[PDB]
Write an enzyme that holds these catalytic residues in place. Structure first.
Site, PDB file in Angstrom:
ATOM      1  N   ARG A 109      29.790   9.523   1.066  1.00  0.00           N
ATOM      2  CA  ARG A 109      30.645   8.680   1.904  1.00  0.00           C
ATOM      3  C   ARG A 109      29.954   7.389   2.332  1.00  0.00           C
ATOM      4  NH1 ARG A 109      35.630  10.664   0.885  1.00  0.00           N
ATOM      5  NH2 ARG A 109      35.606  12.953   1.043  1.00  0.00           N
TER       6      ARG A 109
ATOM      7  N   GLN B 124      42.934  10.964  20.711  1.00  0.00           N
ATOM      8  CA  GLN B 124      43.239   9.788  21.530  1.00  0.00           C
ATOM      9  C   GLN B 124      42.095   9.428  22.491  1.00  0.00           C
ATOM     10  OE1 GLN B 124      46.713  10.212  23.991  1.00  0.00           O
ATOM     11  NE2 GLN B 124      46.928   8.002  24.364  1.00  0.00           N
TER      12      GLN B 124
ATOM     13  N   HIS C 245      39.461   6.133  21.636  1.00  0.00           N
ATOM     14  CA  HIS C 245      39.706   5.018  22.550  1.00  0.00           C
ATOM     15  C   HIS C 245      38.450   4.538  23.297  1.00  0.00           C
ATOM     16  CE1 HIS C 245      44.377   4.886  22.720  1.00  0.00           C
ATOM     17  NE2 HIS C 245      43.957   5.258  21.523  1.00  0.00           N
TER      18      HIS C 245
ATOM     19  N   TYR D  82      38.686  22.260   5.186  1.00  0.00           N
ATOM     20  CA  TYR D  82      37.663  22.835   4.308  1.00  0.00           C
ATOM     21  C   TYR D  82      37.284  24.256   4.707  1.00  0.00           C
ATOM     22  CZ  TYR D  82      36.767  17.946   2.855  1.00  0.00           C
ATOM     23  OH  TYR D  82      36.879  16.657   2.406  1.00  0.00           O
TER      24      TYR D  82
ATOM     25  N   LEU E  21      44.336   2.703  10.555  1.00  0.00           N
ATOM     26  CA  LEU E  21      44.602   4.014   9.963  1.00  0.00           C
ATOM     27  C   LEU E  21      44.665   5.146  10.992  1.00  0.00           C
ATOM     28  CD1 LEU E  21      41.999   6.214   9.553  1.00  0.00           C
ATOM     29  CD2 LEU E  21      41.326   4.479   7.878  1.00  0.00           C
ATOM     30  N   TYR E  22      44.104   4.908  12.175  1.00  0.00           N
ATOM     31  CA  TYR E  22      44.009   5.931  13.212  1.00  0.00           C
ATOM     32  C   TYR E  22      45.180   5.890  14.191  1.00  0.00           C
ATOM     33  CZ  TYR E  22      40.405   9.352  14.336  1.00  0.00           C
ATOM     34  OH  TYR E  22      39.661  10.501  14.452  1.00  0.00           O
TER      35      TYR E  22
ATOM     36  N   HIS F 172      50.460   8.192  15.541  1.00  0.00           N
ATOM     37  CA  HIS F 172      51.506   8.478  16.502  1.00  0.00           C
ATOM     38  C   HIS F 172      52.476   9.603  16.106  1.00  0.00           C
ATOM     39  CE1 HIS F 172      49.836   4.736  18.252  1.00  0.00           C
ATOM     40  NE2 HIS F 172      49.994   5.442  19.356  1.00  0.00           N
TER      41      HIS F 172
ATOM     42  N   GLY G 152      39.295   7.102   5.956  1.00  0.00           N
ATOM     43  CA  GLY G 152      38.857   7.552   7.269  1.00  0.00           C
ATOM     44  C   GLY G 152      37.469   8.160   7.295  1.00  0.00           C
TER      45      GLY G 152
ATOM     46  N   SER H 151      34.335   7.140   9.599  1.00  0.00           N
ATOM     47  CA  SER H 151      33.954   8.191  10.537  1.00  0.00           C
ATOM     48  C   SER H 151      32.472   8.545  10.475  1.00  0.00           C
ATOM     49  CB  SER H 151      34.797   9.435  10.303  1.00  0.00           C
ATOM     50  OG  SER H 151      34.190  10.568  10.905  1.00  0.00           O
TER      51      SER H 151
HETATM   52  C1  COH Z   1      44.504   9.155  17.946  1.00  0.00           C
HETATM   53  C2  COH Z   1      45.794   9.493  18.031  1.00  0.00           C
HETATM   54  C3  COH Z   1      46.690   8.849  19.113  1.00  0.00           C
HETATM   55  C4  COH Z   1      47.463   9.497  19.995  1.00  0.00           C
HETATM   56  C5  COH Z   1      47.612  11.032  20.115  1.00  0.00           C
HETATM   57  C6  COH Z   1      48.135   8.509  20.826  1.00  0.00           C
HETATM   58  C7  COH Z   1      49.018   8.748  21.865  1.00  0.00           C
HETATM   59  C8  COH Z   1      49.789   7.813  22.534  1.00  0.00           C
HETATM   60  C9  COH Z   1      50.785   8.069  23.568  1.00  0.00           C
HETATM   61  C10 COH Z   1      51.185   9.445  24.140  1.00  0.00           C
HETATM   62  C11 COH Z   1      50.256  10.225  24.692  1.00  0.00           C
HETATM   63  C12 COH Z   1      51.306   6.897  23.945  1.00  0.00           C
HETATM   64  C13 COH Z   1      52.399   6.685  25.019  1.00  0.00           C
HETATM   65  C14 COH Z   1      50.660   5.850  23.171  1.00  0.00           C
HETATM   66  C15 COH Z   1      50.912   4.495  23.258  1.00  0.00           C
HETATM   67  C16 COH Z   1      50.141   3.478  22.731  1.00  0.00           C
HETATM   68  N1  COH Z   1      49.120   3.639  21.812  1.00  0.00           N
HETATM   69 CO1  COH Z   1      48.425   5.474  20.998  1.00  0.00          CO
HETATM   70  N2  COH Z   1      47.721   7.265  20.397  1.00  0.00           N
HETATM   71  C17 COH Z   1      46.835   7.425  19.347  1.00  0.00           C
HETATM   72  C18 COH Z   1      46.215   6.402  18.652  1.00  0.00           C
HETATM   73  C19 COH Z   1      46.190   5.061  18.990  1.00  0.00           C
HETATM   74  C20 COH Z   1      45.184   4.104  18.579  1.00  0.00           C
HETATM   75  C21 COH Z   1      43.953   4.378  17.687  1.00  0.00           C
HETATM   76  C22 COH Z   1      45.608   2.769  19.215  1.00  0.00           C
HETATM   77  C23 COH Z   1      44.893   1.408  19.118  1.00  0.00           C
HETATM   78  C24 COH Z   1      44.049   1.261  20.382  1.00  0.00           C
HETATM   79  C25 COH Z   1      43.550  -0.152  20.548  1.00  0.00           C
HETATM   80  O1  COH Z   1      43.490  -0.887  19.527  1.00  0.00           O
HETATM   81  O2  COH Z   1      43.204  -0.538  21.699  1.00  0.00           O
HETATM   82  C26 COH Z   1      46.821   3.053  19.950  1.00  0.00           C
HETATM   83  C27 COH Z   1      47.554   2.132  20.671  1.00  0.00           C
HETATM   84  C28 COH Z   1      48.597   2.393  21.533  1.00  0.00           C
HETATM   85  C29 COH Z   1      49.325   1.413  22.315  1.00  0.00           C
HETATM   86  C30 COH Z   1      49.064  -0.111  22.293  1.00  0.00           C
HETATM   87  C31 COH Z   1      49.991  -0.712  21.237  1.00  0.00           C
HETATM   88  C32 COH Z   1      49.251  -1.648  20.318  1.00  0.00           C
HETATM   89  O3  COH Z   1      49.633  -2.852  20.297  1.00  0.00           O
HETATM   90  O4  COH Z   1      48.298  -1.199  19.610  1.00  0.00           O
HETATM   91  C33 COH Z   1      50.257   2.061  23.034  1.00  0.00           C
HETATM   92  C34 COH Z   1      51.278   1.428  24.017  1.00  0.00           C
HETATM   93  N3  COH Z   1      47.126   4.402  19.786  1.00  0.00           N
HETATM   94  N4  COH Z   1      49.745   6.446  22.324  1.00  0.00           N
HETATM   95  C1  LIG Z   2      33.616   5.034  14.809  1.00  0.00           C
HETATM   96  C2  LIG Z   2      33.210   6.449  15.131  1.00  0.00           C
HETATM   97  C3  LIG Z   2      33.670   7.395  14.031  1.00  0.00           C
HETATM   98  C4  LIG Z   2      33.641   8.802  14.537  1.00  0.00           C
HETATM   99  C5  LIG Z   2      34.620   9.683  13.769  1.00  0.00           C
HETATM  100  C6  LIG Z   2      35.911   9.829  14.565  1.00  0.00           C
HETATM  101  C7  LIG Z   2      37.049  10.037  13.957  1.00  0.00           C
HETATM  102  C8  LIG Z   2      37.058  10.122  12.437  1.00  0.00           C
HETATM  103  C9  LIG Z   2      37.722  11.419  12.009  1.00  0.00           C
HETATM  104  C10 LIG Z   2      38.600  11.394  11.022  1.00  0.00           C
HETATM  105  C11 LIG Z   2      38.960  10.111  10.267  1.00  0.00           C
HETATM  106  C12 LIG Z   2      40.165  10.366   9.349  1.00  0.00           C
HETATM  107  C13 LIG Z   2      40.155  11.177   8.283  1.00  0.00           C
HETATM  108  C14 LIG Z   2      38.928  11.960   7.808  1.00  0.00           C
HETATM  109  C15 LIG Z   2      38.958  13.381   8.387  1.00  0.00           C
HETATM  110  C16 LIG Z   2      38.741  14.477   7.659  1.00  0.00           C
HETATM  111  C17 LIG Z   2      38.471  14.399   6.156  1.00  0.00           C
HETATM  112  C18 LIG Z   2      37.247  15.184   5.721  1.00  0.00           C
HETATM  113  C19 LIG Z   2      35.955  14.573   6.249  1.00  0.00           C
HETATM  114  C20 LIG Z   2      34.824  14.632   5.212  1.00  0.00           C
HETATM  115  O1  LIG Z   2      35.115  15.105   4.093  1.00  0.00           O
HETATM  116  O2  LIG Z   2      33.702  14.162   5.537  1.00  0.00           O
HETATM  117  C21 LIG Z   2      33.193  14.378   6.662  1.00  0.00           C
HETATM  118  C22 LIG Z   2      31.986  13.476   6.927  1.00  0.00           C
HETATM  119  O3  LIG Z   2      32.279  12.262   6.789  1.00  0.00           O
HETATM  120  C23 LIG Z   2      31.509  13.739   8.355  1.00  0.00           C
HETATM  121  O4  LIG Z   2      30.900  12.750   8.808  1.00  0.00           O
END
Ligand code: COH
Ligand SMILES: CCCCC/C=C\C/C=C\C/C=C\C/C=C\CCCC(=O)OC[C@@H](O)CO
Ligand code: COH
Ligand SMILES: *[C@@H]1O[C@H](CO)[C@@H](O[C@@H]2O[C@H](CO)[C@@H](O[C@@H]3O[C@H](CO)[C@@H](O)[C@H](O)[C@@H]3O)[C@H](O)[C@H]2NC(C)=O)[C@H](O)[C@H]1NC(C)=O
Ligand SMILES: *[C@@H]1O[C@@H](CO)[C@@H](O[C@@H]2O[C@H](CO)[C@@H](O)[C@H](O)[C@H]2NC(C)=O)[C@H](O)[C@H]1NC(C)=O
Ligand SMILES: *[C@@H]1O[C@H](CO)[C@@H](O[C@@H]2O[C@H](CO)[C@@H](O)[C@H](O)[C@H]2NC(C)=O)[C@H](O)[C@H]1NC(C)=O
Ligand SMILES: *[C@@H]1O[C@H](CO)[C@@H](O[C@@H]2O[C@H](CO)[C@@H](O)[C@H](O)[C@H]2NC(C)=O)[C@H](O)[C@H]1NC(C)=O
Ligand SMILES: CCCCC/C=C\C/C=C\C/C=C\C/C=C\CCCC(=O)OC[C@@H](O)CO
Ligand SMILES: CCCCCCCCO[C@@H]1O[C@H](CO)[C@@H](O)[C@H](O)[C@H]1O
Ligand SMILES: *[C@@H]1O[C@H](CO)[C@@H](O)[C@H](O)[C@H]1NC(C)=O
Ligand SMILES: *[C@@H]1O[C@H](CO)[C@@H](O)[C@H](O)[C@H]1NC(C)=O
Lengths: 552, 551
Positions: free
Chosen positions: B89, B172, B176, B324, B353-354, B357, B495, B499
């Site tokens: 990776r 989340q 964040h 896995y 990519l993260y 939603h 990802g 990661s």
């Molecule tokens: C990781 C999964 C995840 C989850 C479970 C989640 C859960 C939720 C949730 C309910 C609990 C709500 C109400 C929101 C609402 C929002 N999220 Co997320 N978010 C998630 C990943 C993200 C990510 C990553 C960003 C970008 C953050 C940044 O760039 O500051 C984001 C950005 C946002 C924004 C800013 C919009 C923009 O312009 O990017 C809002 C509003 N949201 N989110």
């Molecule tokens: C910026 C900080 C990054 C921290 C990581 C946080 C979130 C990243 C997690 C997932 C990213 C999205 C998809 C990949 C998840 C699982 C796939 C398998 C992972 C693998 O094979 O290598 C696994 C190997 O890469 C382990 O390292």
């Protein structure tokens, strides 16, 4: 008091308190074990027996010119030796960095806070019974006394390696991009957040400053033309803040990247040369790329000049300093199959070792004139009156002072040299011998061994009482020099690893950067890989005067 | 227009204009040569012949459970396989980083300016005839149409991998700390200047904020006790600024490291859990070191929690995601004889990519209650009313949504999903297929190939016309998932390298940090090496409820 005060852990083992009066040594990956990491593993014991001393290696590199003349001209052998030189000195620097003035243990604050100089050795704990830990007297000797007895110049001692004023001023200009102490905060803090060779001393530390220095046409830096000659622009013109006494005429208040460079016409000479070089490179790139805009032209020129700087520092500057018959090479490819971290954090001790004020002559001799320090300081009219050609011709011929050997700090800068000692103590520096051990050197067993002489050694013996509490900075300036050399062992062996990391650690040396396309194509790449102190002057100074870092 | 608009250089070749209408490809170290870096060198031919596809590798890791059971119990073999996982990776990420939103060529500004997200691929030039370069129409399809047709949830589609709300909220909370878009500057800018796992979301981004959050006794963080339970302190008590709607009562304005964590009680749950853990670790370190002061207790606890975080992410979180049968390992020593850069810069594409939603449910089910988005958002009363134990129990039970496979973005966050598309375009992202090629994946030859299906594919074709202008973000949410999996190939293959860098790049993983003494001795070090999502909850949540990222 802190149980680690005595520095009990040897061979890079890490000391941790385990109670009020108890410590433990972490010997992880040191090659040693036992209570203080002093019992060697079997493989380690063989390595110590086989490893030649730095003084042996130095002898080899500075003799047998006939063998080196062969090595230098066989590209495969030259590369091999240089690869060894680079890797032998890399493993000595913590990277990612560790300690600082406020942190004797690893912390996210010490790692993440770029405002600190980093530390090769942690500071002596605040509650330690003595300044060096547990050894020596309750107070170190008066710094003015150390200064006066073993540091101050009685009579000018010329450098036997023939270092000139071109070298001395290049040393000052170059290092002041990364030694920029934030005196507002304290001696352990820096203003150079790039922590290396980013050329902020030309371009400005901040975007705000940079944009005030830029022409925004053809990638170029702003400038003025005085008597047909290109100089940096004024403070008035740019609104770039500089340090000048109030009585300096507007026109001679030159604005450059680094705010202190008006202090010395020698610094302004290089500031002017590098400004011209940037604009010259803009012309070349514009010719290659008529399609490019101002921004790409500016940025690409910056990367080229960074490359030129590292090239010159290795192959001319360090080359001169070393005294080696072997020709050092700047070649990032040498590290592509090696383990190496492309990052750097400037070490406080690197700053301290670099206080080479003995280099400074009694007078600054340009053309037929001999200027005192008082006449030279803040006086850019000298530069204008004589011009860059005469500056180069004069500085190339004027010898600099010897750094090691003792008693060669000019009285004009005695307060600066006293400040190096005072700030070292304020930053709770460990002793000379602790630093020696840190960089795999044998601790000195007497003052006579340190100086290779009797008089200064006796003075120091009465001042410090124990060799194990002799301080780093004054030791560097009184150290017995290598034969007919500018420096003693400690200077070279501490300075070289810090230097390597600052130079090779730069992102432009990394595989994804080290490509023709990064630099506008083969033409830009060529500018880097053929740069020399001579070509820098030749391209940017009227009449292409001869120059080099030695008087010869 | 810019001669590189078509992205002519393949296999990681760098494109450079050489005139108004000419370009040149720099093929240095790509293992390819020729005008477009498409002619493979001999060694490369053999490498490409023997290289298994990501789908093949995925199959092996997700089948033969009995063999992996054996492999998992032999430490030498587990280490050798994990080492391979890490090193395969690694080479995909530029480190030191290169491009950003403002710089399609390498520059000192792009390298040195930490305020930018970095970019895995340079932006499309400003003067290109089409949004993706030269291919496709003058305009991309209406982002509303893309959203409505293929992204928005009709029926809730549960994740077949069984991801729960503990997972979704951990995702989340965890991410964040490093996705902190500086909306005042633009979508290509970040406030997370540490660019990784520094736990600023617990401790604060700046020293001033950290100092307001600290107790300055025993290395601990400030806290309050409500009904015998430890919670974060208030805005009023700390003077720590937080994002809250004006109507939120002063007692309900919890102050934590990260400004937005009051948005969602799921985030405040983890904020509380990690605050407790910090203070728990302080207690342990004080027992190990009665001689230590507040500063060292605090700093060492932070280092341990950073280690715990990375440990949990790899061995529980990524473990669960991957599907896995092989047990992933957090072990910095695996890289000590390897070429690896202990540094990270957060990529904009990693952020993009993260945006998972589709993970979110239609309602949040705690105990006997079902909370709509409206009721849940900004409502920390819910946390106090139920308590952390019931939060853990409930969130562990509730299934999250499938991310790939299309049509699973809850309506409640449609504007957020639309923003991910719009901001991608504003940031001049290259196409999906360009990103696939960037990560050693075969370009999709049709919309049907992308979705594994017909209905959405035909809608996308009508919208985009050419598969080579399909956008990255919508692609990830509609992509044919792996069998019974949460994600498709593109999500995992982009990802995982981002990661790995963020986790292993951390300075605590470097050889000079990865020592017992860094963490206050063997006890502090073991906290890291034995950390788990279960232990985190067990040690810090009344009753030690059972937990995991599945079910
Ligand atoms: C990781 C999964 C995840 C989850 C479970 C989640 C859960 C939720 C949730 C309910 C609990 C709500 C109400 C929101 C609402 C929002 N999220 Co997320 N978010 C998630 C990943 C993200 C990510 C990553 C960003 C970008 C953050 C940044 O760039 O500051 C984001 C950005 C946002 C924004 C800013 C919009 C923009 O312009 O990017 C809002 C509003 N949201 N989110
Ligand atoms: C910026 C900080 C990054 C921290 C990581 C946080 C979130 C990243 C997690 C997932 C990213 C999205 C998809 C990949 C998840 C699982 C796939 C398998 C992972 C693998 O094979 O290598 C696994 C190997 O890469 C382990 O390292
Ligand atoms: C490399 C050799 C070298 C030379 C030739 C040189 C030449 C001269 C010179 C006449 C040309 C004068 C008047 C001075 C005077 C000073 N030097 Co130097 N210095 C040198 C190396 C250094 C270094 C390194 C520092 C520390 C800079 C820092 O920490 O900011 C320094 C610091 C100073 C300072 C206070 C720190 C500051 O921020 O300015 C003064 C004053 N000086 N020096
Ligand atoms: C990197 O480290 C330095 C040194 O610790 C940090 O500077 C210090 O910042 C703190 C808090 O911002 C300053 O503390 C004080 O806070 C109050 C105001 O609420 C006031 O009583 C004081 O006058 C002062 O402002 C402290 O002065 C300062 N220390 C210095 C300048 O030596 C710096 O913030 C750190 N950098 C980063 C990016 O975290
Ligand atoms: C490792 O640590 C040192 C401590 O610096 C040493 O302890 C010292 O031993 C000296 C004998 O040469 C004593 O004179 C001195 O009192 C004592 N210092 C203290 C404070 O204990 C240990 O003996 C040594 N251990 C090993 C195993 O070599
Ligand atoms: C990193 O880049 C950003 C964007 O170019 C810089 O922020 C700008 O700085 C200029 C000059 O100081 C301001 O006039 C603008 O308002 C800023 N632009 C914005 C907000 O997008 C920032 O200064 C750079 N960081 C550093 C340390 O140089
Ligand atoms: C390298 O790529 C360029 C651009 O993709 C190729 O030139 C194009 O080739 C196609 C088919 O041969 C023609 O329809 C066009 O005239 C070109 N396209 C564009 C965008 O103008 C070129 O063939 C490639 N070179 C090699 C050696 O394969
Ligand atoms: C960041 C650069 C700082 C300025 C560099 C100049 C001097 C460093 C300061 C003190 C060291 C004293 C003398 C250095 C010159 C020669 C020593 C040997 C050089 C070497 O082994 O490789 C050298 C190898 O490291 C080069 O790459
Ligand atoms: C700049 C000249 C130094 C003046 C300060 C004198 C402080 C006393 O220093 C003495 O100087 C003598 C003359 O060099 C030496 O013989 C002694 O070894 C030294 O201790
Ligand atoms: C500055 O240098 C000039 C020569 O250019 C000299 O004549 C003058 O006396 C100097 N001024 C000061 C203040 O020393
Ligand atoms: C917040 O949650 C409580 C339950 O604790 C609920 O009764 C209330 O309606 C919610 N508040 C709002 C305004 O939605």
């Amino acid at each position: 008091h802190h149980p680690c005060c005595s520095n009990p852990c040897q061979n890079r083992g890490e000391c941790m308190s385990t109670g009020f009066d108890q410590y433990k040594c972490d010997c992880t990956r040191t090659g040693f074990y036992g209570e203080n990491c002093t019992t060697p593993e079997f493989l380690t014991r063989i390595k110590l027996l086989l490893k030649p001393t730095p003084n042996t290696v130095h002898y080899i590199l500075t003799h047998f010119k006939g063998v080196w003349n062969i090595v230098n001209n066989i590209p495969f052998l030259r590369s091999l030796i240089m690869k060894y030189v680079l890797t032998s000195r890399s493993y000595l620097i913590d990277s990612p960095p560790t300690y600082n003035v406020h942190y004797g243990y690893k912390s996210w604050e010490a790692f993440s806070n770029l405002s600190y100089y980093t530390r090769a050795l942690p500071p002596v704990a605040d509650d330690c019974p003595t300044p060096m830990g547990v050894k020596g007297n309750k107070e170190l000797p008066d710094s003015k006394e150390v200064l006066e007895k073993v540091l101050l110049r009685r009579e000018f001692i010329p450098d036997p390696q023939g270092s000139n004023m071109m070298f001395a001023f290049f040393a000052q200009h170059f290092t002041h991009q990364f030694f920029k102490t934030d005196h507002k905060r304290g001696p352990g803090f820096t203003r150079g957040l790039g922590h290396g060779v980013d050329l902020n001393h030309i371009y400005g530390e901040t975007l705000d400053r940079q944009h005030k220095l830029r022409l925004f046409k053809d990638g170029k830096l702003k400038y003025q033309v005085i008597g047909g000659e290109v100089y940096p622009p004024t403070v008035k013109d740019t609104q770039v803040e500089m340090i000048y006494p109030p009585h300096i005429p507007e026109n001679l208040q030159f604005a450059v990247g680094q705010e202190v460079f008006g202090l010395v016409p020698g610094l302004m000479m290089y500031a002017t040369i590098w400004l011209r070089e940037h604009n010259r490179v803009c012309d070349i790139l514009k010719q290659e790329h008529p399609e490019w805009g101002d921004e790409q032209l500016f940025q690409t020129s910056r990367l080229i000049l960074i490359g030129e700087t590292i090239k010159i520092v290795i192959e001319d500057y360090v080359q001169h300093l070393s005294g080696y018959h072997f020709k050092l090479k700047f070649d990032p490819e040498l590290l592509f199959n090696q383990q190496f971290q492309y990052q750097n954090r400037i070490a406080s001790e690197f700053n301290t070792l670099y206080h080479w004020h003995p280099l400074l002559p009694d007078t600054f001799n340009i053309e037929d004139q001999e200027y005192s320090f008082k006449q030279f300081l803040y006086n850019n009219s000298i530069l204008l009156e004589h011009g860059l050609t005469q500056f180069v011709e004069s500085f190339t011929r004027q010898i600099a002072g010897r750094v090691a050997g003792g008693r060669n700090v000019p009285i004009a800068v005695q307060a600066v040299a006293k400040a190096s000692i005072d700030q070292s103590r304020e930053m709770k520096y460990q002793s000379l011998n602790e630093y020696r051990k840190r960089f795999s050197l044998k601790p000195y067993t007497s003052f006579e061994e340190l100086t290779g002489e009797k008089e200064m050694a006796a003075e120091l013996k009465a001042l410090y009482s124990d060799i194990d509490v002799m301080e780093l900075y004054p030791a560097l300036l009184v150290e017995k020099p290598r034969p007919d050399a500018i420096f003693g062992e400690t200077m070279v062996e501490l300075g070289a690893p810090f230097s390597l990391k600052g130079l090779m650690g730069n992102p432009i040396c990394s595989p994804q950067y080290w490509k023709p396309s990064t630099f506008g194509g083969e033409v830009g790449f060529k500018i880097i890989n053929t740069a020399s102190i001579q070509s820098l002057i030749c391209n940017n100074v009227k009449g292409c005067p001869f120059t080099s870092f030695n008087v010869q």
